[PDB]
Write a protein that holds these residues in place. Sequence first.
Motif, PDB file in Angstrom:
ATOM      1  N   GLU A 120       7.289  -0.510  -4.740  1.00 45.58           N
ATOM      2  CA  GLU A 120       6.747  -1.259  -5.862  1.00 45.58           C
ATOM      3  C   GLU A 120       5.474  -1.965  -5.423  1.00 45.58           C
ATOM      4  O   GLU A 120       5.369  -2.424  -4.279  1.00 45.58           O
ATOM      5  N   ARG A 121       4.504  -2.050  -6.332  1.00 35.59           N
ATOM      6  CA  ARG A 121       3.204  -2.598  -5.981  1.00 35.59           C
ATOM      7  C   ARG A 121       2.575  -3.281  -7.186  1.00 35.59           C
ATOM      8  O   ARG A 121       2.698  -2.811  -8.320  1.00 35.59           O
TER       9      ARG A 121
ATOM     10  N   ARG B 296       5.616   1.316 -10.037  1.00 36.05           N
ATOM     11  CA  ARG B 296       6.925   1.554  -9.441  1.00 36.05           C
ATOM     12  C   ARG B 296       7.022   3.037  -9.121  1.00 36.05           C
ATOM     13  O   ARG B 296       6.927   3.873 -10.027  1.00 36.05           O
ATOM     14  N   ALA B 297       7.197   3.369  -7.842  1.00 37.95           N
ATOM     15  CA  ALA B 297       7.243   4.756  -7.408  1.00 37.95           C
ATOM     16  C   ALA B 297       8.517   5.012  -6.623  1.00 37.95           C
ATOM     17  O   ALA B 297       8.987   4.146  -5.882  1.00 37.95           O
TER      18      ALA B 297
ATOM     19  N   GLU C 256       5.221   5.419 -11.794  1.00 41.30           N
ATOM     20  CA  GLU C 256       5.031   4.889 -13.139  1.00 41.30           C
ATOM     21  C   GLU C 256       4.109   3.682 -13.033  1.00 41.30           C
ATOM     22  O   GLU C 256       4.379   2.757 -12.259  1.00 41.30           O
ATOM     23  N   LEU C 257       3.025   3.695 -13.808  1.00 46.14           N
ATOM     24  CA  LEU C 257       1.963   2.703 -13.712  1.00 46.14           C
ATOM     25  C   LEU C 257       1.688   2.104 -15.080  1.00 46.14           C
ATOM     26  O   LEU C 257       1.632   2.821 -16.082  1.00 46.14           O
ATOM     27  N   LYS C 258       1.513   0.784 -15.118  1.00 43.98           N
ATOM     28  CA  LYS C 258       1.055   0.102 -16.324  1.00 43.98           C
ATOM     29  C   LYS C 258       0.031  -0.950 -15.927  1.00 43.98           C
ATOM     30  O   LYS C 258       0.313  -1.809 -15.089  1.00 43.98           O
TER      31      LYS C 258
ATOM     32  N   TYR D  57      -0.277  -5.932  -3.330  1.00 43.12           N
ATOM     33  CA  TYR D  57       0.955  -6.653  -3.035  1.00 43.12           C
ATOM     34  C   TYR D  57       2.101  -5.656  -3.125  1.00 43.12           C
ATOM     35  O   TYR D  57       2.497  -5.264  -4.225  1.00 43.12           O
ATOM     36  N   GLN D  58       2.637  -5.242  -1.978  1.00 40.49           N
ATOM     37  CA  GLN D  58       3.554  -4.117  -1.898  1.00 40.49           C
ATOM     38  C   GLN D  58       4.896  -4.546  -1.329  1.00 40.49           C
ATOM     39  O   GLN D  58       4.968  -5.406  -0.447  1.00 40.49           O
TER      40      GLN D  58
END
Length: 394
Positions: free
Chosen positions: A92-93, A106-107, A121-123, A338-339
């Motif tokens: 997550e980042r 979220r990958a 998934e990116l927003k 920020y990961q």
Amino acid sequence: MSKGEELFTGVVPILVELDGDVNGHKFSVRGEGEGDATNGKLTLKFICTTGKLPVPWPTLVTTLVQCFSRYPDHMKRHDFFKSAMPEGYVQERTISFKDDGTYKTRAEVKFEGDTLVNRIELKGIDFKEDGNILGHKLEYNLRVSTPRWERIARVLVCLLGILLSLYAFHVEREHARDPSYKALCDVSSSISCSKVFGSRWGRGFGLLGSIFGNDSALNQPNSVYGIVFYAFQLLLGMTVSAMAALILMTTSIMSVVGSLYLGYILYFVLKDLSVICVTTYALNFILFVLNYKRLVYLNEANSHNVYITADKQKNGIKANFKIRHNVEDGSVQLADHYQQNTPIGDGPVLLPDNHYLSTQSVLSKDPNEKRDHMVLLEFVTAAGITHGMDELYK
């Protein structure tokens, strides 16, 4: 020191599927390629399957498989990414752009058969419409570089100096055949190119010819030293290193002092005007400005470092860093990353000590490709933990 590292002893195919939604602009990317963790090498090709991409490609590199990082021999124990395999891990980042929106990603990165898959998934929200991202105002690379000005200006000034040096070289080579010859910069007495180029100070700067001899190959016309200076400053200006800082700074000091010296010769002993030599003095001034500006632009405040630290409360890892994208206008776009990563399964993973990964990225384009795409080469290594002195003997 994992059982998943054994799955990376060779070349592994890589699939990457991303479905993103940035301020309504929706898109999907699919990138396929391969990775060789033994060398930390990554070779991937990404295409935007939904037509055009609403964001600059560099803003998605960090989001589009740190389990392919080459770990040194002693640091295998801190390679959390490999240990979470084959069951995989969730990454997550959050990415905050200064004075712009924010990505949330979220990958899930796991093994599907022989393939290392990364489903993302990116927003992104709160982005400006005329901003740098949705305005596509970012350069096409991940380089820690100075902007297009100063680079274009360096190459420009260097080429101009080179051409002036060639012309001076020819003027001298012909004043030696026939003194009675008008160059384009010989308008009269007091204003003559041949007077300065045919002078005793035209070969070897007036000195060095009395220490090696007037016949040695080291006593070249000053225009040869000029060509070498500008050309070498160019070739080393392409590179961005502190070594380059040293070399270019010594050469720049010598250039400026010798410039004031040769100018002293022009005004005083020779009582003559050479607009070309004055131009060269200006060029030298610029090059000193550039070496100085670059020296102060080596600040800490090429490859990027991502600092991985442990996360015991999560049974995983954390990372935090900054990517600095270059804007074409001359400004800089700062993306704070920020990961956090956690294994998908309930198996045992490696909790590492503080370290970092050096990441070297190179973007390119396939000419025979009509869709929007990105060609990505990467080299990732682990570092931050030096092999300790070997003591166990006797």
